[PDB]
Amino acid sequence: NLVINPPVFITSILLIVALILTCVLFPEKVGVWFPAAQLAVTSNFGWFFVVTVNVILIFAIYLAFSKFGRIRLGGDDAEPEFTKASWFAMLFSTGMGIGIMFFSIAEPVSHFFNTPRPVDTDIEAAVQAMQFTSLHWGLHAWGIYAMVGLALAFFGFNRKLPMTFRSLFYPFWGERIHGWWGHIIDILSALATVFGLSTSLGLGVIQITAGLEYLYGWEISPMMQAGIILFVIGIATISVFSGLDKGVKILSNANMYIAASFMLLIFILGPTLFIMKGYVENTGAYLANFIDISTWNDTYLGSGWQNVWTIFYWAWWIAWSPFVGSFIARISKGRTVKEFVLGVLIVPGLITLLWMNVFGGSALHTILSGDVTMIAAVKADVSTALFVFLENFPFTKFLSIVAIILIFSFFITSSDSGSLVVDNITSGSNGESPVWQRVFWSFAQGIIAIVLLWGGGLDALQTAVIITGLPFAVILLVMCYSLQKGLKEELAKSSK
Amino acid sequence: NLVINPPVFITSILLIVALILTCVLFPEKVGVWFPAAQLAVTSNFGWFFVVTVNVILIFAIYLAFSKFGRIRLGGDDAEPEFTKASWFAMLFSTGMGIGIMFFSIAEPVSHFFNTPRPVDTDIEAAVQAMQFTSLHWGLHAWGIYAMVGLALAFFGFNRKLPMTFRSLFYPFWGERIHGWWGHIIDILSALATVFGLSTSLGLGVIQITAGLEYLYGWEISPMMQAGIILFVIGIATISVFSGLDKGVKILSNANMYIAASFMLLIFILGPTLFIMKGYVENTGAYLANFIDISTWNDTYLGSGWQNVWTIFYWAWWIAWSPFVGSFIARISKGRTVKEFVLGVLIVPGLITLLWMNVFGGSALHTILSGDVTMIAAVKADVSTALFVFLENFPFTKFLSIVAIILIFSFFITSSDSGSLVVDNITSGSNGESPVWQRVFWSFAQGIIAIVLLWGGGLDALQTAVIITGLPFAVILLVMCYSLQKGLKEELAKSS
Amino acid sequence: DNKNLVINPPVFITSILLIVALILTCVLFPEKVGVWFPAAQLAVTSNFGWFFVVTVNVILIFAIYLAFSKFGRIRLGGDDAEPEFTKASWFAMLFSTGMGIGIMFFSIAEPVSHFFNTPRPVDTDIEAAVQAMQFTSLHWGLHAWGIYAMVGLALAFFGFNRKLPMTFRSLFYPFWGERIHGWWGHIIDILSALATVFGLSTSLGLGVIQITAGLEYLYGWEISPMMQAGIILFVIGIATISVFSGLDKGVKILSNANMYIAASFMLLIFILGPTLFIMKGYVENTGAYLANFIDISTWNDTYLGSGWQNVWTIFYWAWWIAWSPFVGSFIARISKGRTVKEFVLGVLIVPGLITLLWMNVFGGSALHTILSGDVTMIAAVKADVSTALFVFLENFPFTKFLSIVAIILIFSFFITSSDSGSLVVDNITSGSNGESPVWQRVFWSFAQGIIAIVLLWGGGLDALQTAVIITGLPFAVILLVMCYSLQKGLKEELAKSSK
C-alpha cells in the first residue's frame, strides 16, 4: 500500500535525495564544505551542546526525585510486563553498542596519547582518559535517552497519542501540531534518527572491514564495503519480508548474552584485579569530578579537542534519541517515572562504565606496562584498535571473529530497529505501515552510510550527526519543558 | 517633630561623631591604629567569618528545602505585588551594584597577577581568578542577603513586628528586646549599615575620580572628592522634600536597563563565544570546587591574602546585610520561604556571575592574548581598571562616560535607600520621621565616606567594614537560629 | 559441667577451640607463623582492597539513605519509647566505645607518616600536609562512624523493636526467619565473636605498645616482652577484680572520667599549641575532606600500585568492620526511644566531627611544627611509630606531666576496653543477655589478654593488623548482607505499622 504521511514522507525523501546528490555530483566541493560546516557548528555551539546535555540530565534527575516520580506510565493500574532485572537487561540492549565496540579501546587510548587537558605523568593521562570516556559514555548519554524515552512513554501511554516527536509538544502547542509545526519537528526527528543510524552503520562497517584486513590480510575496497552494506541490508530485510520478528527479536538477547560472555572473557583473561580496582576508582573519580568535566568547555586553551570527541558525542546522543528513547519507551509500560528514570540512568550507565573499564582500562594497563604498539595502531587508524587489543589475549583469532560477528549482529539489529522507528515516525501509522516502507528505509540508511563513508568516512558521519543534532538539541530542550508541563497536567488531573 | 528612638539615635550619633573626631584630630595615630586593628581582626577571625558565611548559606538552603519552605511571607493570603519574572530582576539588592562596577575587572586581574594559591600556568591563574571572583560575588553574598531578607520579611509580615533588627530575636530573647538588649543590636545594625553604605559611597567616588582623571586628566584633589560627595548628597536631598520620584525610584529599572545595556555591549563587542564558554565552564568549576574554596582558610601558606579579599568581602556582605535585606524583604510579600530563598539565591547570583564573566573574563582573555597593560594599570591603582578595560573597545570615551553616569546613579540610589533604612532603624514604625532626619543621615554617610577616604582611602573602608562586621557576624548567626525557632513556632501555631 | 554454665553451644566450644588452635600455632610454629601471617595479610589486602572500599562506601551510603528515607521516622524501642538521656548527653556518649586507644596511637603517628610517606605523589610539603590531613580524616571520619551507626542501628532495631537477643544472628531474621538456630546463625555468631575478640585484642596490643614506648621514652626503662605480658596480666587482673566486686557502675564512672580527661587533654593541646592555626586547619581540612570525599573514599591506588593501602586504608576498613559489633552493641544499648534518622545523624556527624577535631588538634599541630622546620617527629616516627605522641609532647610545657596523663588515659581506656569487650563477647557467645556467671566474662577478658600477648610476641603491630584484616575480610560480606537484612526488617516494621 501507500500508508504514508504526505508532508513528512515526501519532505524527508527529497531532503535525503538532495543530500545524496550533492555528495555524489560534487566529489570535491562537499569534501571541503562538510569539514568547514562541522567546525563552525562545533566551535560556535559546543557551549550550547554542553548546556543542553547538562540541563537534560538535571531535568531527568529532578523528575526522578520530585512529585512527578510517582506517576506510573500507562496509567495507575498499569502493570510492568517484565521484572526489574529483565527490564534492566533489556535497557542495556537499546544502547546499540556498535559505538561501544568501536570506541571501548580507541577512545581511552586516544585520550591517553592526545590528552584533553595537559597532564604531568602517564598515570594522570590514564586517569583523565578514563574520566573523559566515562563522561562520554556515562550519565549524560543515558540521561538524554531516559528523558526522551520518558517523554515518549508518557505521551504514548498516559495520553494515548502516537509515539511520535510531534505529539511530545502537545502541552503548549495544543492542536497546532498538525501542519508545518509538528511536520517540521517530525521531519527533523526522522532526519536525526536516519543520520544517527547511518553513523552507527558506518562505524560498524568500518570496524568490520578493519577486522577482516587485520585478520586475513585482505584489501577491502570501498566497493567491497558498499557490497557488504547492501548484502547486510538485504539479509535484514529478508526477515521483514518473510518471518517478521524472528530471528531478530531473539537476536537482541543473543547479542546481549554474547557481549556479556565477551566482556567476561576479557575481564578474566585480562588484569582482573586491576580491572576491578580501576572500575571502582574510576567510577568514584568520574562522580567526584562530575561537574568539572560535564561543564568543561576548553575555554582558555582553545585546543579544539571537544570538536571531535565531546561535542560530537553530545550531538550523536541527541540525534540518536528519537530511536533509543523510542525503544526504551516501548518496553517500559507500567513503570513509575522515578523508577523508570533510575533504571535507565544508573544500571545501563554502570554496565557501560564496566565495559569501558574492562576494555579501555585493560588497554591502558597494557600501555602503562611499556607496550605501546596499541598507541601506534590507534594513531595509524582508529578502526583496528580493538583487534590490536585482542592481540594481547589468548585465542586472538577466535576473539576477533567473535567481535566481528557481534558487530555484524549489532548492525543487523540496529538497522531493523531504526527502520521500524523511522517508518513509524515518518508514516505516522504506528504499526499499520506496509513492509516495503521499512525495507525502503533500511535501503535509505544503507545508501546514506555508503555515501558518507565514500565522502569522508568517519569525519562525514561526525559532521552529519553534529549538524542534525544541533537543532534537535534545541528541540530536546523544548521537549523537556513540554514533558514537565504534561506531567504537571497529569498530576493536576489526578489526585482529586 | 523629633520622632526618634532615644537610646539608638543618640548612641549611634555619639559613636559616629566620636570616630569622626578621632580620625580628624589624630591624623597619623589613626593611620597606624586602624591597619593594625584590621590586621588583628582578620588574622584572628577569618576562620570565624568563613564559618559564619558557610553556615548562613547552608541554613538558607536548608530552609528552602525543609518543612519551613511552604511557609508564605505575610500569611496564607498570598497576593504578591509583582510577578516572579519581574521579581527576579527587582531582587538585585538595593541596586545592581557599585562594588560590582569597582571589582568587575580589578578583582579578576588582581587574582591573576597576585594568585590566592600557587599555580603553574597562566591558564590556571585565570581559572583560579574567575573561581575566587565567583566565590566572593556568588552564592555566599546572596545567601547572607537572602537569610537577612527572609528574617525581616517573616518578622515584619507574618508577625507584624517593625522591620528592625531587634525584632528578629523575639523568638529567642522573648519580650526582653526592648531595652539595652535590643537597643545594642539596633545600634550595631545601624552602625554596620552606615559603614557598608559609606564604603560603597567611597568606592563610587574613588572610581568616578579615577575615571575623570583617566578621561581628561583633571587631577581631582581630595577636596574635590569631598565636594563631589557633598554635591551628590545635596542632589539626593533635593530628591527628598519634593515627594521623591524625581529623583529616586525613577532610576529603576532605568539603572537596571542601563546596566543591562552596558553588559550587553561589552558581551557583544568583546569575545562573545569566549564569554559564553567561560561563563558555562567557570560556573561549573565554581560549583565543582564549592566546598574547597568556601572553607579554604590559607592555613598552611599563611600568605595573608584573605585579609584583603575574602575576609573583607564576607565582612562587607555581613555589614551590608540590613541595608540589602530591608528591600529584599519589602518587595517580597506573599511568596513562600522556599520560593523566596531560591529566587534570591539562584537568579541574582547567576546574573552576578554572568556580569563577572562578561567583564573580568573578557579582561583575562585580553591578558592571556598578550596585552598586559591592564595588569600594570591594576597594580598602579585598581580604581582605573574598568576604564583601562574600556580602552579595548569601540567608543571608549562614550562607554567610560556611561559607566561614570551609572556609578553616579547607583550612588544616588544607594545613598537614598541607606538613608531610609537607617532612619527606619533609628526611629521605627516605618512611617516616621520627617525627612530632615533622612537628610541628616545622608549627610552623615557622606561625611563618614569623606573622612575614611582622607584617612586611608580604600584601606580605611575595608577596616571599618571588617571591624563593624565581626560582631554583626555573631549577631547574624544568632539571628539565623532565632529565625529558625520563629519559623518552627509559626509552623506549630498553624494547626 | 554443672548449673554454673550458661554457655550457648557450640559457639562457646567452637570459638574457644579456634582461639586455642591459633594460639598453639603461633606459640609452637614461630617461623611458620612469621612467614605465613604477612603473606596471608598481603594476599587478602591486595585481592580485596577494592571489596573493602566498596563495603565501607556502601555501608555509609546505606546509613545516609536510611537517615533520609521513609525509614527515618521509625523510633527504636517502639513508637511510645522515650530516650533515656538528653540529646547532648547522648551525643557525648556516642563519642565513645571506640576506646580512644587507636585515636591516641594514631593522633600524631598517622599524619606524620602520611607526610613523610605520602599516599600519592605531591610536589610541595604543603600539599603533603594537606593530603596527610585528608587521608587521616578519611580513615577516622565518616566511614568508621557509618559502619558503627549501621551495626548499632541493626542491633537496636532487632533488640528493641523485635525483642530478639542482641546478637548478630538475629540481625538476619528478615532473610532466613527461623533458620538461625544452628550452623547458619551459629557460624555468624562464631565469626562475630572472633572478629570482636580480635579487634579488641588489636586495641589492647596498641595500648600496651604505646604505654611501653611512653615508659621507655620517659624513664629510660627497658621493657622486655615479659614485662609487657606482666602489664597485660596486671590489667586483666585489677579489671577482673573490679568485675568480681560488683563494680558495674565503677566502669561507667571510669568511662565518664575518661571522657572528661580526654576533653581536658585536647583542650590543653589546643590552647598551648597553635590555637589559631588549629582552628583554621580544622575548618579548612574538614572542608577539603568533604570536597574530595568521593575522590578519596573510592581511591584504590590502581595505577601506581604502591601497596600503601595495604597498611593504612584497607587495615582501617578491616579494623572498623571487625570492630563494629563491639562498638554497635553499646551504641545500640544507649539509643532507645530515638528515631532512625536522629540516631544515624547523631552517630555520624557529632562523633565524626569531634574525632576530626581531635585529629586536627594533634596531627595538624604536629604538621605545623614539622612545616616550621622541626623534623624530629618525622625521624621519631620512622624509628618507631609508638613514641610519636610523646615526642609530640616534647614541644609543650609540662612535657612529663602531659606524658604521664596520656599514659594514664591509655591505661584507663585499656580497662574500659577490656571490660566492655568482655561483656560483649560473653553476651554473644553465651546468648543470654547478661545472665552468665562472672567467671565467663573473666575468662573472656583473660582470653583477650592472652591473644594480645601472643600477637605482640609474634610480630607486634604487624600481627595485630594481620589478625584484624583476616578476621574482617568475611565480616565485610556479613555486614553487607546485614545491611539489606536491616532494610528488609525496616520495611517489615513500616508495613506492620500504620494499622
**Cβ–Cβ < 8 Å for A441, A240:** no
Task: Output the CA torsion sign for B186, B188, B189, B193.
Answer: positive
The single-letter DSSP state of residue B336 is B
C210 belongs to a structural domain: yes
Q: What's the Rg (C-alpha) of chain C?
A: 22
Nearest by CB to A278, which of C49, C293, C302? C302
CA distance linking residue A411 with residue C491, whole number of Å: 45
Residues in contact with C217: Cβ distance below 8 Å, sequence separation at least 6, in sequence order:
C387, C390, C391, C403
CA distance linking residue B104 with residue B378, whole number of Å: 12
Which residues on chain C are in Cβ contact (under 8 Å) with A277? 49-50, 300-302
Which DSSP string do the residues of C266-319 spell out, in sequence order?
HHHHHHHS-HHHHHHHHHHHHHHHHHTHHHHHS---TTT---GGGTTHHHHHHH
How far is residue A295 from each of residues A332, B353, C276, measured CA to CA in Å? 31, 15, 37
Q: What are phi and psi of C498, to 5 degrees?
A: 55, 40
The parent domain of residue A213 ranges over 6-491
Q: What amino acid occupies position C221?
A: W
Angle between helices C185-219 and C11-28 (to 10 degrees): 40
Nearest by CB to B280, which of A44, A50, A118? A50
CA distance linking residue B85 with residue B339, whole number of Å: 12
CA distance linking residue B330 with residue B311, whole number of Å: 29
CA distance linking residue B316 with residue B200, whole number of Å: 10
CA distance linking residue B293 with residue B132, whole number of Å: 7
Residues of B in CB contact (< 8 Å) with A are 121, 123, 126-127, 273-274, 276-278, 280-285, 287-289, 368
Cell of C110: 598517622
Q: Which of A306, A44, A43, A300 is nearest to B366 (CA)?
A: A300
CA distance linking residue C300 with residue A275, whole number of Å: 11
CA distance linking residue C389 with residue C210, whole number of Å: 9
| CA atoms within 13 Å, Cβ hemisphere of B370 | 0
- Interface contact flag, A44 B285, Cβ < 8 Å: no
CA distance linking residue C364 with residue C381, whole number of Å: 15
Spell out a b/e string for A9-47, using b for 16 or more CB atoms within 10 Å of the CB, else e: bebbeeebeebbeebeeeeeebeeebeeebeebbbebbb
**Cβ–Cβ < 8 Å for B364, B130:** yes
Q: What are phi and psi of A96, to 5 degrees?
A: 55, 65
Q: Which of C55, C254, C87 is nearest to C151 (CA)?
A: C55
Cell of C336: 532507645
E strand or H helix at C212, and its extent? Answer: helix C185-219
- C137 to chain B, minimum CA–CA distance in Å? 15
- A58 to chain B, minimum CA–CA distance in Å? 13
Q: Which of B103, B57, B140 is nearest to B314 (CA)?
A: B140
Tell me the Ramachandran region of residue B448: left when phi exceeds 0, alpha when psi lies from -120 to 50, beta otherwise: alpha
**Cβ–Cβ < 8 Å for A73, A158:** yes
**Cβ–Cβ < 8 Å for B299, C277:** yes
A496 belongs to a structural domain: no
Within 10 Å of residue B16's Cβ, how many Cβ atoms? 20
Long-range contacts of B25-32 (CB under 8 A, 24+ apart): B27/B455, B30/B455, B31/B455, B31/B456
CA distance linking residue A258 with residue A101, whole number of Å: 13
Residues in contact with A107: Cβ distance below 8 Å, sequence separation at least 6, in sequence order:
A129, A132, A133, A136, A309, A360
Give the end-to-end CA distance of chain A in Å, rounded to a whole number: 46
Within 10 Å of residue C126's Cβ, how many Cβ atoms? 16
CA distance linking residue A452 with residue A445, whole number of Å: 11
Among all chains, which residue has been given the C-alpha cell 504526505? A6
How far is residue C131 from each of residues A474, B220, C367, C472, measured CA to CA in Å? 44, 52, 11, 27
- Interface contact flag, C302 A277, Cβ < 8 Å: yes
| CA atoms within 13 Å, Cβ hemisphere of B95 | 31
Cα-Cα-Cα-Cα torsion B150, B155, B158, B161, nearest 10 degrees, comes to: -150
- B476 to chain C, minimum CA–CA distance in Å? 19
Spell out a b/e string for A467-478, using b for 16 or more CB atoms within 10 Å of the CB, else e: bbbbbbbebbbe
CA distance linking residue C473 with residue C458, whole number of Å: 21
Q: What amino acid occupies position B311?
A: I
Residues in contact with A286: Cβ distance below 8 Å, sequence separation at least 6, in sequence order:
A130, A131, A134, A135, A138, A293, A353
**CATH code of residue B319:** 1.20.1740.10
Task: Output the CA torsion sign for C294, C300, C305, C306.
Answer: positive
Nearest by CB to B300, which of C126, C276, C291? C126
Q: Which of A404, A406, A407, A377 is nearest to A392 (CA)?
A: A377
Cell of A268: 578474566
Which residues on chain B are in Cβ contact (under 8 Å) with C292? 292
E strand or H helix at A301, and its extent? Answer: none
Among all chains, which residue has been given the C-alpha cell 518587595? B331
Q: How many CB pairs under 8 A join B and C?
A: 47
CA distance linking residue A93 with residue C57, whole number of Å: 29
**Cβ–Cβ < 8 Å for A435, A404:** no
- A293 to chain B, minimum CA–CA distance in Å? 9
- Interface contact flag, A46 B277, Cβ < 8 Å: yes
Residues in contact with C368: Cβ distance below 8 Å, sequence separation at least 6, in sequence order:
C273, C274, C277, C281
Residue in chain A lying closest to B124 (CA): A300
Q: What amino acid occupies position A20?
A: I
Q: What are phi and psi of B297, to 5 degrees?
A: -125, 5
- Interface contact flag, B127 A295, Cβ < 8 Å: no
**Cβ–Cβ < 8 Å for B107, B309:** yes
For testing contact with chain B, the best of A293, A300, A306, A307 (most B CBs within 10 A): A300
- Give bridge partners of residue A72 from the DSSP assignment: A336
Long-range contacts of A241-247 (CB under 8 A, 24+ apart): A241/A435, A241/A439, A244/A435
The single-letter DSSP state of residue B432 is -
In chain B, breaks (C-N over 2.5 A) are found after none
CA distance linking residue A197 with residue A191, whole number of Å: 10
**Cβ–Cβ < 8 Å for B413, B230:** no
- Interface contact flag, B280 A301, Cβ < 8 Å: no
User: How many domains does chain C contain in total?
Assistant: 1
Q: What are phi and psi of A72, to 5 degrees?
A: -100, 125
Nearest by CB to A296, which of B121, B126, B281? B281
Q: Which of A288, A232, A264, A247 is nearest to A446 (CA)?
A: A232
Any idea how long chain C is? 499
Q: How many CB pairs under 8 A join A and C?
A: 47
CA distance linking residue B73 with residue C365, whole number of Å: 48
Q: How far is CA B124 from the centre of its chain?
A: 28
Q: What amino acid occupies position C350?
A: V
Q: Which of C157, C201, C436 is nearest to C326 (CA)?
A: C201
Spell out a b/e string for B139-156, using b for 16 or more CB atoms within 10 Å of the CB, else e: bbbbbbbbbbbbbbbbbb
| Burial class of residue A434 in the structure, from the number of CB atoms within 10 Å of its CB (0-12 exposed, 13-18 middle, 19+ buried) | middle
The single-letter DSSP state of residue A157 is I
Nearest by CB to A281, which of C47, C292, C299? C299
B-contacting chains (≥3 CB pairs under 8 Å)? A, C
Cα-Cα-Cα-Cα torsion C110, C113, C114, C115, nearest 10 degrees, comes to: 120
CA distance linking residue A265 with residue C48, whole number of Å: 21
Nearest by CB to A274, which of C293, C295, C302? C302
Nearest by CB to B47, which of C280, C290, C371? C280
- Interface contact flag, A281 C304, Cβ < 8 Å: no
Among all chains, which residue has been given the C-alpha cell 560582631? B471
Structure method: cryo-EM
Q: Which of C58, C169, C80, C157 is nearest to C490 (CA)?
A: C157
**Cβ–Cβ < 8 Å for A202, A415:** no
Instruction: Give CA angle at A406 (A405, A408), nearest 5°.
Output: 60
- A324 to chain B, minimum CA–CA distance in Å? 28
Cell of A437: 516502507
B1 belongs to a structural domain: no
B411 belongs to a structural domain: yes
- Interface contact flag, B295 C286, Cβ < 8 Å: yes
| Burial class of residue B183 in the structure, from the number of CB atoms within 10 Å of its CB (0-12 exposed, 13-18 middle, 19+ buried) | middle
Residues of C in CB contact (< 8 Å) with A are 46-47, 49-50, 53-54, 292-295, 297-304
Give the end-to-end CA distance of chain C in Å, rounded to a whole number: 49
- C258 to chain B, minimum CA–CA distance in Å? 30
**Cβ–Cβ < 8 Å for B292, C291:** yes
Q: Which of B56, B3, B28, B30 is nearest to B483 (CA)?
A: B56
- A157 to chain C, minimum CA–CA distance in Å? 30
- A85 to chain B, minimum CA–CA distance in Å? 33
Which residues on chain C are in Cβ contact (under 8 Å) with B291? 287-288, 290-291
Residues of A in CB contact (< 8 Å) with C are 123, 126-127, 273-274, 276-278, 280-285, 287-289, 368
CA distance linking residue C27 with residue B93, whole number of Å: 77
- In chain B, DSSP finds a helix count (H) and a strand count (E) of 21, 0
- Interface contact flag, B281 A295, Cβ < 8 Å: yes
Which residues on chain B are in Cβ contact (under 8 Å) with C288? 291-292, 295
Which residues on chain B are in Cβ contact (under 8 Å) with C280? 46-47, 297-299
Cα-Cα-Cα-Cα torsion C194, C197, C199, C205, nearest 10 degrees, comes to: -140
E strand or H helix at C261, and its extent? Answer: helix C248-272
Q: Rounded to a whole number, what is the largest CA-CA distance in chain C?
A: 70
Residues in contact with C315: Cβ distance below 8 Å, sequence separation at least 6, in sequence order:
C45, C465, C468, C469
Residues in contact with C54: Cβ distance below 8 Å, sequence separation at least 6, in sequence order:
A280
A248 belongs to a structural domain: yes
CA distance linking residue B389 with residue A383, whole number of Å: 49
Give the end-to-end CA distance of chain B in Å, rounded to a whole number: 45
A1 belongs to a structural domain: no
| Burial class of residue A485 in the structure, from the number of CB atoms within 10 Å of its CB (0-12 exposed, 13-18 middle, 19+ buried) | middle
E strand or H helix at A316, and its extent? Answer: helix A310-330
- Say whether B72 sits in a helix, a strand or coil: strand
Among all chains, which residue has been given the C-alpha cell 562596577? B101
E strand or H helix at C437, and its extent? Answer: none
Spell out a b/e string for B288-305, using b for 16 or more CB atoms within 10 Å of the CB, else e: bbbbbbbbbbbbbeeeeb
Within 10 Å of residue A269's Cβ, how many Cβ atoms? 14
CA distance linking residue A494 with residue A383, whole number of Å: 53
- Interface contact flag, B277 A51, Cβ < 8 Å: no
CA distance linking residue B303 with residue A459, whole number of Å: 51
Spell out a b/e string for A158-180, using b for 16 or more CB atoms within 10 Å of the CB, else e: beebbbbbbbbbbbebeeebeee
Task: Output the CA torsion sign for C163, C167, C171, C174.
Answer: negative
- Interface contact flag, B296 C284, Cβ < 8 Å: yes
- Interface contact flag, A288 C302, Cβ < 8 Å: no
- Say whether B114 sits in a helix, a strand or coil: coil
CA distance linking residue C96 with residue C413, whole number of Å: 10
Angle between helices A139-153 and A29-64 (to 10 degrees): 70
**Cβ–Cβ < 8 Å for A364, A104:** no
Residue in chain C lying closest to A123 (CA): C303
Which residues on chain A are in Cβ contact (under 8 Å) with B126? 300
Task: Output the CA torsion sign for A214, A215, A221, A227.
Answer: negative
Instruction: Give CA angle at A190 (A186, A192), nearest 5°.
Output: 115
Residues of A in CB contact (< 8 Å) with B are 43-44, 46-47, 50-51, 118, 289-292, 294-301
- B167 to chain A, minimum CA–CA distance in Å? 36
Cell of A339: 523508577
**Cβ–Cβ < 8 Å for B383, B110:** no
- Interface contact flag, A300 B368, Cβ < 8 Å: yes
CA distance linking residue B265 with residue B253, whole number of Å: 18
Which residues on chain C are in Cβ contact (under 8 Å) with A289? 295
**Cβ–Cβ < 8 Å for C107, C367:** no
Cell of B387: 576604564
Cell of B171: 523568638
